[model samples]
Target: PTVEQQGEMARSGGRMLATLEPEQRAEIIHHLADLLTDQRDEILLANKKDLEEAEGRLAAPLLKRLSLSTSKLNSLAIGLRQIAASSQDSVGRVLRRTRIAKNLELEQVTVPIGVLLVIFESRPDCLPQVAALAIASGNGLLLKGGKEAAHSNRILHLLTQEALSIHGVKEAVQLVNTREEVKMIDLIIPRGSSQLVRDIQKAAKGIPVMGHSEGICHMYVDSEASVDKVTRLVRDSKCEYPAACNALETLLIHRDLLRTPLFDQIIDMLRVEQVKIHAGPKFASKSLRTEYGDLELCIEVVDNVQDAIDHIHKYGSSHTDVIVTEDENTAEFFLQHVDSACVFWNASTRFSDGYRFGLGAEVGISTSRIHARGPVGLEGLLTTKWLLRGKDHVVSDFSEHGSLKYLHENLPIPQRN
Candidate 1:
């Protein structure tokens, strides 16, 4: 199709999405979950073919990402239902209300950001996740999956379209075949490597982009941290799912605790999982800023809390950072000073996920300070608009004749069921 056609489709999709009521959108998500369950076998078969074709061509991590099974499909189905159950209505919710004059009223309300174009890598599960969020938030989506998961993505896209057709909104979700189509989208979110994100950012010059390239997450062990707690948290943070963007890539220990038994226990625990540790001089020699989405870790010793904070600001990706400490004051201090999308205290960095945060699912994790940050969820897919109503009021009465004065008083927002 031509670029003009793509733009027209996007505009039409946005209009269709805007016409649906909040309850109607929720029902569509519930229907989507039911359809996914009924068509589980077909989806699994499609994913199997993708894995077979990508077996030797892709790396171990990419292959792991590409492979989809019944378990993942079941999880996707559950996620759709959870999104439907969320209480926060995305559209038409009143953000603020005020009275400008005796009979003039103004309101700031939530609305969709129109069309979204998402380019993602080998994770076929991302297809459903993105589709579910877009549907629930009342936004049209254009998805582009990597070639490695083409078969898998196609089937999932078909399933989503089938569900949308059941709800009489088939054009709300689309699958684009080429990169050139991105120019027609209102917003672009690229979810893959740093280089892919960079390229997309360059190509999408006018469109707003929300996504993170790297996940150089850090976990700092404060002087007040418990030995057993730190050991378990660090092990889970790195080994639970190393390929995830929330996985811990760097570990910082207080300098006073370097030779302590706690440090020894932490090292032994990581070694049990065959995690390769680069520490001290070794860590400094290599790129400490690398997002090793594998079983490798970089360990450093910092002088104190301030030292840890400074190091993270220098080498972190502004993704997710953690500080494990029992002291409330120290935890508060760390949380206030760290400049990242997600900051944690007495917890593993792995908890910084949209699903775990009860967002149902995420479009992507964003490190940007503007618009949305942390996990990009349904709220992130929205923008706001101001609505004003007047009873035959003219600006000339206030400006030229000075016959009327503005009230400028706060007013109650009308509740929606």
Candidate 2:
């Protein structure tokens, strides 16, 4: 085994994850949250070092993620507590059961994905958040974080392993500071730039990549929308955490709202925030398909709800799109039709977060629809396996022998031992 990685260790480590019952894993996450609060001063010291190195190097939005503050730590601990409070039987529960033969039973039970390689950038707090999610999901993990937050990640990782060891499964999560760990991954999740995601896709031999390349979210202001809600949502969605994937990037104004006092208030508020505005019929020279990840935003005028939906489908990232309308009918219509992973009516796009959704501190907000969508938390990391219990039952006996036959009977799931 190279000093950097041990495939065998990760594989066996993953097995150990499945060995612990759900509540046992919950105890470890609870312990992690405690360790975090107790070691706040030490964690912040390491964070300070990372900030100095990344002060001028990282972009504004990312730099915010790179720096770990007291409130951020508090939020992380709160999420950890929430994760631990989840159902003790969340994992290893039988989803479905069937009796195929007189003496044979078949079952579909939830199981953890073998091993995960999560590569992220900037956010040092992500180390513990992701560690807790992996543990809660019962999946062994490897985290490859950015060098800018190396010091912060180092300390956070130390605490995570300590929590694991305290619960007797330290190998459950490991940080990647060594060689091509990509070769040892069951599923590779990239949480960085579009370029980073694409490069991994190109370099990967057979690994499945799960992540969104863009966060071009949108918010549509309907004619019947309340000025009060519109004003509040607009400010919070665009300025709340402008760098976040859930932040609103595009705005669609109703054609009727043009030249109105309500519309005027929007312009003044945006100007106060110092957000660069781009509007259309004819969009400004800059690419409309961009996730500005800052104070810059793009706006377009739409004739109605259908028009707004069409625009989002054409130009949006299918991440999180919102519509502001007071009319219950109109709000429901927008929520039903917008095909983004998360759609909101009279709610800020910023609400489309896993932590905000009350799912622990999410591993990542998934935009992919197949395996998982929206915000990926504990259940998102799980896959199911089919378990069959048979006594000297053969398939050929059922197929060839007239005396034996398949009797498919649905049954109540029996609890795990």
Candidate 3:
């Protein structure tokens, strides 16, 4: 098909989307919550199939990403209900209004970005969230979930489609059943390994893709950092869920802070949990590397900039980089230059999420520096338009010498109902 035809075919799907009233949109999300509640048995049964296959095909870290329990499912439903109840977006709200001439008026407003394509891995919960965000923002979505949760993904899509049809909307939400077809998506929003993200980015033709490239997330212990705070931050950031994109993939410690009992306490907690530790010249030992050979959970200590830079530049995922500094200057420096999605200062990198940020639901934590970075929420799915109006205004020589006259007026605009 021609590019215009392809664009039209995709944009045509927006008809269903545009028909969704605010309450109807809420209904869709509520339907998702109800479906998840009523279909728990079927959802778990499908997840079990994916989990069984993932056990052999994926690594321990990835296997953990694929595995889903009842609690996670319930959390997913809660996220759906929260999003459904969120206040209407100011997307189409007129941000400004002015009159250039007696017959012409101008206004600026927000609009949808036509169609969106989300490419994600593991975590079946992502399926409903992305769909909800797309519909909420008046856009169609073509979702391509990873292979690990293929069965669960399929069932979720089917149930959501049923809900859409029941609401008298055509299935604007499409889930690609095969990898090859999924690759044909117009926009790819990857949320998995760096390789998957890079592959989608490289394959993006003229399509406007939105997502992060990497998530080499980190946390730095400042010289003035409280030992207790650092210990808690490191433990929660690293140990709570190492498989996540926001998890601290590495730690940075100031040489001055190592003398405190906090460093040892942090190390001891991780060690007791059987997390491997890889130390720099300041803290390296042969046994450390050997213990962490499998590399599921490992802590590495570094001394200087080059060391930390080299490690992150080499091995980082570029997801949620952080700095735990008591000094504002140090925190500012790290926040200014660190190339990651969600940067933190004196806080755990674990805060890098949609729910934590009060976004209701997250499409995914995109690690890319693009149209949508950080938490991909309903607002993330939208774009803006510059509504220009004038009384047949044309660029003429009359205004070049500042000879043009205009009347200025300031009036309060009515708020949207």
Candidate 4:
């Protein structure tokens, strides 16, 4: 079938899941997690085949995303279980309640979005993670994973289908193996090389999209920044996960701090991590918007908090930005001024994540300002609708010449579940 046909199937399956009891949906997710654990060996074997086949054909860093271990499989299961447990109240939750008149009521309630098409990078585990979130949120999912991860993605996708079949909602998720360029998806996250995502952003005109096109995240070291905090934040953000989108790519240092020994120490530390430090204000290395996705760093000196904020606005991808400062005013200024999906103070940029924020797991991180931003979890997968209850009341009842009165009173939302 075509990708659009599969998406329409997902739309039908979405309705099937929307009516399911929250507890039942959660049960299916938990069952899928159990399957991941029970079939760990099977998954790992497939992952090995995928990795061995893609070794020389794929880039070194890209291959890292395709490889999986027993521990990684176990972690995926645990994450799915967490999503199942955490999303008990996700669907059909009341957002607001209002009394329009006697025996009449209105409510804003959460519900699953009709269909979603997620195109992700080489991470095979992303298949199950996104599936767990889709099931938890009662949303239908259409997935397109990196071709290098075909074997592992197949096994995980099948396992999730098994979970859905046991719950009688087998169509809730579908995986496509096509390499054809698809358009008009409800939502798509083109997660791959920076240029690939950028190209998709333009060509994918009608499709709603999420995720940062690239990860040119930045961190600023203010004049009053704590030496201890700067030391740890820089190391953790850059070295902890060099291949991750949240990893720090640019370092903005205060001109005042340049006179201190910590400046030299930070450069030395980057050297220790084997990061190819690119000093700035001289040559615009890749236009200051480069996401090296490796052990690489951009060092630029800024005058103060405003300079740092301006630099981020000018060059950063709005993915994640951080400032290390002990002074409350300086920290607050940086946080408020840096218009990124995630703005942090005295924290590592890598801390911007769905799991870290207690959302269980993320489909991917977003820099887009509409619908959802940052690490997208269950809430991101959901859209709300109005549910009104009334007893044979006509709209003219509240008209200017009508005898009945419009109360327009705010009422407490009831916990339906």
Point to the candidate with the largest lDDT: 1
Q: What digit string (tens of lDDT, one per residue) describes model 4 on residues 109-178? A: 8888767888777888788888889888888888888778899989998999999987788887988865
CA RMSD, predictions in order: 2.4, 2.5, 4.6, 2.6
Say what the RMSD of model 2 is.
2.5
lDDT of 2 by residue, 31-147 (tens): 899988999999999999989888888877578788888998998999999998984666787898999999899999888887888888787877888888888888888888887
Q: Which scores greater on lDDT, model 2 or model 3?
A: 2
Off by over 4 Å in 1: 1-6, 178-183, 281-285, 394-396, 399-401, 414-417
Clashing pairs in 2: none
Could you say which candidate leads in TM-score? 2
TM-score of each: 0.93, 0.94, 0.82, 0.92
Q: Per-residue lDDT tens digits of candidate 1, residues 1-417?
A: 654565567567767867787777788788888878898888888888998898888877778889778887787788888898883466778889999999999999988888888898898988888998988778888888878898999998888888887667877788877455434578998888788888888887788889988899999998889876998899989999998888999999887777689888998999899999887552343787988888999998888899889989999999999999888998999999999999999788999878878888889899999999999888898899999999999898888567999999998766644
> What tens-digit string does per-residue lDDT give for candidate 3 at 320-397?
767765677767776776666676787887798886787767877775566777888887777778776665665462
lDDT of each: 0.85, 0.84, 0.69, 0.84
**Cα RMSD, model 4:** 2.6
Name the regions of candidate 3 deviating beyond 4 angstroms: 1-10, 58-62, 179-186, 281-318, 325-340, 397-417
Ranked candidates (lDDT, high to low): 1, 4, 2, 3
Clashes (backbone N, CA, C under 3 Å), per candidate, total: 0, 0, 11, 0
CA deviation > 4 Å runs, candidate 4? 1-5, 183-185, 203-205, 282-286, 392-397, 415-417
Model 2 Cα shift for residue 158 (angstroms):
0.8
* Ordering by TM-score: 2, 1, 4, 3
User: Clashing residue pairs, candidate 1?
Assistant: none
